[PDB]
Amino acid sequence: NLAQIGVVGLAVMGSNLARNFARNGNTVAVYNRSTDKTDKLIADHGSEGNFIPSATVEEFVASLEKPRRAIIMVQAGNATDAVINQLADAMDEGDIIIDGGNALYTDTIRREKEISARGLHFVGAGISGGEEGALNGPSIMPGGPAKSYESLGPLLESIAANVDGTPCVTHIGPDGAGHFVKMVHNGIEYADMQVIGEAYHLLRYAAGMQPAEIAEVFKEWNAGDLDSYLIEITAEVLSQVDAETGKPLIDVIVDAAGQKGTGRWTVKAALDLGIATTGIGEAVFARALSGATSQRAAAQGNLPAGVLTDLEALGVDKAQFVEDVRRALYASKLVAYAQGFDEIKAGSDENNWDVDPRDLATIWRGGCIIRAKFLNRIVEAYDANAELESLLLDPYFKSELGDLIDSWRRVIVTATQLGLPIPVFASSLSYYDSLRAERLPAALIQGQRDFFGAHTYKRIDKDGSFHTEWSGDRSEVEA
Amino acid sequence: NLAQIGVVGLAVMGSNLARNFARNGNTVAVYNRSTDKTDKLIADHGSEGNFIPSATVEEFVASLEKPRRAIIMVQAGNATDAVINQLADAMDEGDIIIDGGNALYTDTIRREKEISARGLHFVGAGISGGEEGALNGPSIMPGGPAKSYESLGPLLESIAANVDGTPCVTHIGPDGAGHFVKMVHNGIEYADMQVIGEAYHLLRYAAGMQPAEIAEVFKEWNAGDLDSYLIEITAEVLSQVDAETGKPLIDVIVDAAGQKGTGRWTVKAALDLGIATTGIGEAVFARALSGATSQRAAAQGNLPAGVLTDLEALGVDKAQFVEDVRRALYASKLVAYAQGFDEIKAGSDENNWDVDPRDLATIWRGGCIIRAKFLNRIVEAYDANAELESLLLDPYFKSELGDLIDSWRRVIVTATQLGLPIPVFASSLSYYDSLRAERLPAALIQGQRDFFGAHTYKRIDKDGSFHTEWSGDRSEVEA
Ligand SMILES: NC(=O)c1ccc[n+]([C@@H]2O[C@H](COP(=O)([O-])OP(=O)(O)OC[C@H]3O[C@@H](n4cnc5c(N)ncnc54)[C@H](OP(=O)(O)O)[C@@H]3O)[C@@H](O)[C@H]2O)c1
Ligand SMILES: NC(=O)c1ccc[n+]([C@@H]2O[C@H](COP(=O)([O-])OP(=O)(O)OC[C@H]3O[C@@H](n4cnc5c(N)ncnc54)[C@H](OP(=O)(O)O)[C@@H]3O)[C@@H](O)[C@H]2O)c1
Ligand SMILES: [Mg+2]
Ligand SMILES: [Mg+2]
Ligand SMILES: [Mg+2]
Ligand SMILES: [Mg+2]
Ligand SMILES: [Mg+2]
Ligand SMILES: [Mg+2]
Numbered sequence: 001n002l003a004q005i006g007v008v009g010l011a012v013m014g015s016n017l018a019r020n021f022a023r024n025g026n027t028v029a030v031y032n033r034s035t036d037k038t039d040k041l042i043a044d045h046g047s048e049g050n051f052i053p054s055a056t057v058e059e060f061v062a063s064l065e066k067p068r069r070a071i072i073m074v075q076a077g078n079a080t081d082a083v084i085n086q087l088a089d090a091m092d093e094g095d096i097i098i099d100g101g102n103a104l105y106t107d108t109i110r111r112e113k114e115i116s117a118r119g120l121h122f123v124g125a126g127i128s129g130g131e132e133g134a135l136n137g138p139s140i141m142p143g144g145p146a147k148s149y150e151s152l153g154p155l156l157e158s159i160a161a162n163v164d165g166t167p168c169v170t171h172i173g174p175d176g177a178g179h180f181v182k183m184v185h186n187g188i189e190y191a192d193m194q195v196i197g198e199a200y201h202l203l204r205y206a207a208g209m210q211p212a213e214i215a216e217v218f219k220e221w222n223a224g225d226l227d228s229y230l231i232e233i234t235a236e237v238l239s240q241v242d243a244e245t246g247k248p249l250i251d252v253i254v255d256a257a258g259q260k261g262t263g264r265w266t267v268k269a270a271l272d273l274g275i276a277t278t279g280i281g282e283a284v285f286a287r288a289l290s291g292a293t294s295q296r297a298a299a300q301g302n303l304p305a306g307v308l309t310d311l312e313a314l315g316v317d318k319a320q321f322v323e324d325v326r327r328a329l330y331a332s333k334l335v336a337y338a339q340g341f342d343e344i345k346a347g348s349d350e351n352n353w354d355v356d357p358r359d360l361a362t363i364w365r366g367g368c369i370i371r372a373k374f375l376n377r378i379v380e381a382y383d384a385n386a387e388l389e390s391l392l393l394d395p396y397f398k399s400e401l402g403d404l405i406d407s408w409r410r411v412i413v414t415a416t417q418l419g420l421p422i423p424v425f426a427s428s429l430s431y432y433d434s435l436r437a438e439r440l441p442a443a444l445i446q447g448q449r450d451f452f453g454a455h456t457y458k459r460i461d462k463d464g465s466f467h468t469e470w471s472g473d474r475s476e477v478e479a
Numbered sequence: 480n481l482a483q484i485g486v487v488g489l490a491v492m493g494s495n496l497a498r499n500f501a502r503n504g505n506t507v508a509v510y511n512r513s514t515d516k517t518d519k520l521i522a523d524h525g526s527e528g529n530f531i532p533s534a535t536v537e538e539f540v541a542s543l544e545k546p547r548r549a550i551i552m553v554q555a556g557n558a559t560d561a562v563i564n565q566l567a568d569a570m571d572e573g574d575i576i577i578d579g580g581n582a583l584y585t586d587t588i589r590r591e592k593e594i595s596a597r598g599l600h601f602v603g604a605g606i607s608g609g610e611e612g613a614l615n616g617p618s619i620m621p622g623g624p625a626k627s628y629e630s631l632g633p634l635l636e637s638i639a640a641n642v643d644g645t646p647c648v649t650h651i652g653p654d655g656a657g658h659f660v661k662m663v664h665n666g667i668e669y670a671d672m673q674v675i676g677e678a679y680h681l682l683r684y685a686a687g688m689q690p691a692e693i694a695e696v697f698k699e700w701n702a703g704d705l706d707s708y709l710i711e712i713t714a715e716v717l718s719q720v721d722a723e724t725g726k727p728l729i730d731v732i733v734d735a736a737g738q739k740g741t742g743r744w745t746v747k748a749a750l751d752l753g754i755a756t757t758g759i760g761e762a763v764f765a766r767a768l769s770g771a772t773s774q775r776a777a778a779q780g781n782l783p784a785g786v787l788t789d790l791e792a793l794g795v796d797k798a799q800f801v802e803d804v805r806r807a808l809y810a811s812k813l814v815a816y817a818q819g820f821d822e823i824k825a826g827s828d829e830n831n832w833d834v835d836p837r838d839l840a841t842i843w844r845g846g847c848i849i850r851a852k853f854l855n856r857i858v859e860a861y862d863a864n865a866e867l868e869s870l871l872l873d874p875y876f877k878s879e880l881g882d883l884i885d886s887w888r889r890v891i892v893t894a895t896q897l898g899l900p901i902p903v904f905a906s907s908l909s910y911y912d913s914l915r916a917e918r919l920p921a922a923l924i925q926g927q928r929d930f931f932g933a934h935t936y937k938r939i940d941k942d943g944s945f946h947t948e949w950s951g952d953r954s955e956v957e958a
Contacts, residue, residue, distance in 0.1 A: 130932045193927055197920030230927065233949075237926035240953060245940070249947065249955075254937035255922035264750040271743040276768035281760055282906065289755040289913050290921030295821070298868035299914040303877065306884035342774070369931050389777035398781065405785035412895045412905070416888050421912035421919075426891070426905040427761065433900040434768055435778040440900075441676025442769030443734035447716035448672055448709065452848050453609045458733035461724070468728065474719060476728075 002065040003029035003052045005155045007073055008083050009101075010037040014073030015045070016135035017100065017127070020159040022049025029053075029070075031060035061090040067151050068095040071125065076101050084111060088118055096148050098123040102262065105143075105176035105183055105269075109351075112144060112175040121148045124175070126182020129161070129367040137161035138367040140169035141185075141360075143178030143353075161366025168366040173353035180269075180347050181360055184340050187266025187280040189369050191336035192230050194283035194424045199329045200238070202411065206311055206418050207318050207325075211248035215239040221326055225400075226333075228372035257287035266343070273346035278431045279336025282423040308419045316414065324414075327407035328425050334401070335428035337378065338391035358382045392435065408432075481544040482508035482531050484634045486552055487562055488580075489516040493552030494524070495613035496579065496606070496638075501528025503637040508532075508549075510539035540569040546630050547574040550604070555580050563590060563601075572598035575627055579604045581741060584655035584662060584748075588830070591623060591654040600627045603654070605661020608640070608846040616640035617846040619648035620664075620839075622657030622832075640845025647845035652832035659748075659826050660839050663819050666745025666759035668848050670815035671709050673762035673903045678808045679717070681890065685790060685897050686797050686804075690717040690727040700805050704879075705812075707851035737770035745822070752825035757910045758815025761902040787898045795893065803893075806886035807904050809879070814907035816857065817870035837861045871914065 006029030007018040014032075018041065021028040027050040032038045038053045045051075054060040061068060068091055072083045080101055087097050097120055099108065108124030115122035126141035127134060140156045142149065149171040161168040172178040196218075203209045203217060215238035222231045240249040263284045270277040289296075311321055341357055348355035361378035365371050381394035391397055412429050415422040434440060449455040456465040456479040465479035485508035486497040493511075497520065500507045506529040511517045517532045524530075533539040540547060547570055551562050559580055566576050576594055578587065578601075587603030594601035602623035606613060619635045621628065628650040640647040651657045682688045682696060694717035701710045719728035742763045749756035768775075790800055820836055827834035840857035844850050860873035870876055891908050894901040913919060928934040935944040935958040944958040 132931075193924050194920075196927075197923050200923050201920050229931075233927060233930045234923070236949065237923065237930055240926070240947060243955065250922045250926055251918075252938050252940055253922040253925045254939055255919045255925070256937070257921040257924045258928060258934060259753055267750055268747045271746055271763065271767075274738040274767045274770060276764040276771075278761065278764050278902070281764060282757065282909075284750060285755040285757050285760060285910075286913070286919075287921065287924070288750075288753045289910065290919050290924075291753060292755070292821075295868045296914060298872055300917065302872060303911065303915050304881040304884050305915060306888055342771075389774045393777055393781055398783070402783040405783050409785055409895050409898075413892050416891045416895070416908065419888075419912050419915065421909045421916060423757065423906060423909040423913065426909050427902060429895065430761075430900040430902040430905050431764075431768065432782065433898050434765070434902070435775060436782050436784060436898065437900060438779065439730075440734045440765075440769050441673075441680045442736040442766065443729045443732040444676050444679050444713070444716065445672050445736045445766070445769075446732045446734070447719070447729055448675075448712060449736075451712045451716055452708075453611070455739075458735070459731050460733055461731060468719060470715065476722065 003027045003063050004065050004069065006030065006060055006064050006068075006070045008032070008060065008070060008087070009073035010041050011073070012131050013134050014071075015041050016131055017071065017073060017159075018051065019045050019048050020135055020137070021155070022051055024158040025049065026155060026158060027052065029060055029063040031057065057086045057090050061087065066092065066094070067121075068092070069098065069152055069155065070096070071098040071100045073100050076103060077107070081111070084115065088115060088120060091120055093119040094121070096121040096123060096152060098125050098142070098152065100125045100127050102126075102182070103179045104265065105179035108143065108176040108179045116145070121145050123148050123152060124179040125156075126178050126185070128182065128185060128364070129369070133161070133367045138168070139363045141172050141178040141182045141363070142169070143172045143174060143176055143180070145174065146171055160363075163365040166362065168363040168368075170359045170363060172359065173348065173355050174351075176351065177348070177353040177355055180351070180353075181344060181355065183262065183265050183269065184343050184347070185360075185364060185368065185370065187263045187277065187284070188337060188340045190261075190263035190266075190283040190287070191279040191340070191424060192228070192333065192370050194286050195329050195332045195336065196230060196234050197286075198332070198422050198425050199325050200234070202325050202415060202420060202422070203322065205420055206414065207321055211238040211250055217322060225374070226326070226330060226372070228370075228374065230369060230372075255290060256293060257290045259287070259291050261287065263287070266340075269347065270339075270343045273343060273350060275339065275343045275346050276431060277339045277343055278427040279332065279339050279424050282427045283336070286423055305419050309417050311414070314414065314417065321414070324407035324410045327404040328411035331401065331404040331408045331432075332425045332428040333374070334391065334397060335431055336424065339431075341378065341391055356382075390435070392432070482506045482542050483544055483548070484508070485510065485539060485543050485547070485549045487511070487539065487549060487566070488552035489520050490552070491610045492613050494520050495610050496550065496552055497530065498524050498527055499614055499616070499638040500634070501530055504528070505634060505637060506531065508539055508542040510534075510536065536565045537569050540566065545571065545573070546600075547571070548577065548631055548634065549575070550577045550579045552579050555582060556586075559586070560590070563594065567594060567597060567599055570599060573600070575600040575602060575631060577602040577604050577621070577631065579606050581605075581661070582658045583744065584659035587622065587655040587658045595624070600624050602627050602631065603658040604635075605657050605664070607661065607664060607843070608848070612640070612846045617647070618842045620651050620657040620661045620842065621648070622651045622653060622655055622659070624653070625650055640847075642844040645841060647842040647847070649838045649842055651838060652827065652834050655830065656827070656832040656834055659830070659832075660823060660834065662741070662744050662748065663822055663826075664839075664843060664847065664849065665740070666742050666756065666763070667816060667819045669740070669742035669745075669762035669766065670758040670819070670903065671707070671812065671849050673765055674808050674811045674815065675709060675713050677811070677901050677904050678804050679713070680899060681804045681894060681901070682801065684899050685893060686800055690729055694718040696801060704853065705805070705809060705851070707849075707853065709848060709851070735770045735772060736766040738767060740766070742766070745819075748826065749818075749822050752822060752829060754818065754822045754825045755910065756818045756822055757906040758811065758818050758903050761906045762815070765902050784898050788896050790893070793893065793896065800893070803886040803889050806883040807890035810883040810887045810911075811904045811907040812853070813870060813876060813880070814910055815903065818910070820857070820870055835861075869914070871911070
């Protein structure tokens, strides 16, 4: 007569999640502040499994088997803190509050401190895949005490996406580690979509291909190493004809990316952690620029292009160019992921989480928009070398870069000569050529700062800080 | 027997600032929590002018002529709030608390609300030029109530940098406007230093010039449109020989800028405001990458370069290439400033500040690391069009871009073919080519997001939001 799991918040995400639990053989307690949403779920979806509805938090908590597991699925921020307090007040020692919402990981850290203190357990659970994932099988990223997973894990494994028998959930780490890895996942999604956008742009405006032909190229690419959900749905979007006009649907869509989106959080965290996420960063900046409606209108046809050429005048074969774009897309995808996994290691180190990157690449293979067989290469890279300094240095990926790099350079040159924007492709190659470099112009920056501000520099041949007496005899002294 | 201005916090920045006030004929109250610093200022510099040293906040406040003007120069964050509260409790209605520290503008906004509600005035003042500017003439960016500038303005004008008889201080706007434009100024400084670094890297590793020769090139550029303090000091740094090794000083400096600075705050604000600051962003990312010591050590000689060429094999004239790099530097500087001024506009609109960008380009000509005669072109651009959509569209600058664009494309092509990193040069050209684009891949992103999440899109040819039934008959409905 008791539920093993409960959901508070029965808007579409929490209702879909409750249904998932119930379809997979769990008894599920459900509560919503407004009872009409609870009544609607029972009325329209009660045949999907065993639900225990409650009108009050006290009734809801009383319906859960100890140790009690309540997932919150409400509005992020103040509304989730309100429900955490209501559950906290009603629960016993050893009970488990789970926020499944899209929390700021710093909110989850603060909540885990306040709730662990109250004698309760707090889990911040990132849930991927949006409404469809919540209903049919998400990737789940729980952070909190490791002993919370003993009672919660088997429940989450019952609803998670399954890939080759492996549920897309495992314990990520303490406190905010789950919401953190979910946030980085969101930023990676932006980069994956932007590198596809850039490939599309070159195939259309350099190779002269219409959307229906580009769809067919993407389906061919999707049979090879790039194989991915995002490339699969890209072909379906490029194939779609607008019934009203007969034009490709993409050609009647307003080309301004929804300014609603959390990819910016990923880049803010990378800026704080000292990680160069050029790929996610340029993908976010590209969405922002697309929305600058009045600036784009004022710019159109008014900035000098310079002398441009075209593939025919360059003597470039269309088939060779299309393959070069594929290889630029793969290289740029690989840089964006290497940077994202750098951000995961930096966040883990900063927060003492011991995040295992193999767990992330494993559970992102199902119920995620970014799912692709590429992720198995990330698992294998870290399996081979738990302390790998960059995904680019994995023996498999490094050997792949050997075959990509000539194409990648040709795409940057060619796009530039045709006046076509390629922000993540170009920025990824400058980042790559920066990691290759023996000496970077940061040495000059250190010298400039010592000149104007006496900020001091380190030396390659001696430990310590040094200063040149710029305003004086320009001798070097110790700082 | 009363001071017209006071300084709280007598570490080097505040001691320098107090000395500046005193050298310029003001009577200056000085106070530091630790009395030993007050004793030290009086002992070492009391001859420079009329100081009134106090050991306690109450004596300090009693030494000030009403309406009292106290400038706080202490550790940013909680320490600044601690000193604000101690002054506020000791002061009378109409008194003026000024924070001259490197405040987060959101902290200034909060402080101005709290302190104004108590019948005091709060000013957040950005002070540029570091320790040297505090002593010898800074750029000063005060935000707070306009009436505050009437008693404070003449004191700030007595110490500010002066350019052709114009003091580098004016009232910026309400509450946080001052600390906000200082934060953007800090980001711009990063971009100015990075574009100089990229030019240096190309002249050294593409044109085969040694640092002493590059120093002579920068001095010649400094005679033309690029004329700047940063280019002047760059030639002095590149001329410098390390006595101990005989190598160029730059060659014995550790090429790691790391994360010792606040340029990241500029990018985080840009991300929240929806502004594509690709120049400042890539500059900050480049500093972060330079500091990844273990990763760079692991990457050296392990990432495939691809087939590279050189200027000789390309048939490129060295003098033509050097001028092309100058013009890439100019174009990329202009893009970084255009984006920073877009960030200033977006911040001013979000916060109802009515920031006049002419004020900023006027007062950054003195006592700022970014000072350059280029800033006059920004004043003139906004003089001609208060609602200018981008600095790129100013008639003078658009005319300049007609002469820069062919060079700029050649530099991205050539750097790419030689395997040299140019993150701001290349990202600035993708941004430029993105403003030139009729249609951006943002249309494909809108289609993808509608496919996987039913996120809806807008149409170019009629009003409202639409959804294509991707899982069903792929008909379109209004949303
Ligand atoms: N659809 C998407 O694109 C997407 C993707 C991922 C996640 N999400 C989900 O979106 C939700 C965010 O909510 P929203 O603001 O957008 O929708 P909403 O309908 O305004 O709120 C959702 C739920 O929050 C509850 N709630 C709000 N304030 C509360 C309070 N103070 N005390 C108790 N319950 C409270 C509501 O209860 P009432 O019914 O009583 O109002 C409702 O059940 C999260 O659950 C998140 O998981 C969105
Ligand atoms: N190189 C630099 O450090 C540098 C460069 C840029 C800007 N600044 C400027 O210098 C200030 C920052 O100082 P810092 O943090 O770098 O150095 P710090 O040595 O940690 O402290 C700087 C000053 O803050 C005072 N202070 C700290 N906590 C305080 C508190 N709770 N109550 C009152 N006074 C307090 C100290 O007083 P005591 O002597 O009593 O400790 C000292 O006068 C700001 O005004 C900033 O704009 C410094
Ligand atoms: Mg039935
Ligand atoms: Mg299932
Ligand atoms: Mg292969
Ligand atoms: Mg580890
Ligand atoms: Mg002076
Ligand atoms: Mg000229």
